[PDB]
Amino acid sequence: ALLSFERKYRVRGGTLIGGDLFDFWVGPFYVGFFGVTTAFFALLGTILIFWGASQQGTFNPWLINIAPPDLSYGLGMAPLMEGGLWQIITI
């Protein structure tokens, strides 16, 4: 659904990358190439947060905690349960 004055502004063009392959709208939202990359990254991050919450043992929104690794790991990668999920979610 459109506002009373919105139809004349919905033209084609003005994309950095993608052309008319992603040049459309879903509801009020505009999607483009960067709308597909945002959806993927955000959904993956949220699903991983809730998987970590399930493995922690609580689903209480106040008490969910996903933490970085110990200092002894330095700048390397830690096991996914001892702080690696935090690194993936940060990316």
Binding site: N65, A67, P68, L71
Partner: protein, 51 residues
Amino acid sequence: GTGMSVPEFVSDLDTPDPTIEVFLASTSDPVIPEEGAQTAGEAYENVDPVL
């Protein structure tokens, strides 16, 4: 995740307390007393704690 850690420069961590070396240059090993050794009070006039 707590934020509980203590920070230090590595040039400061490699600099020892400078008086450790003064001590090591003023210290000696004890001398084990022998059988019936002569004490300090039988050689001078001193105070009870050190006699």
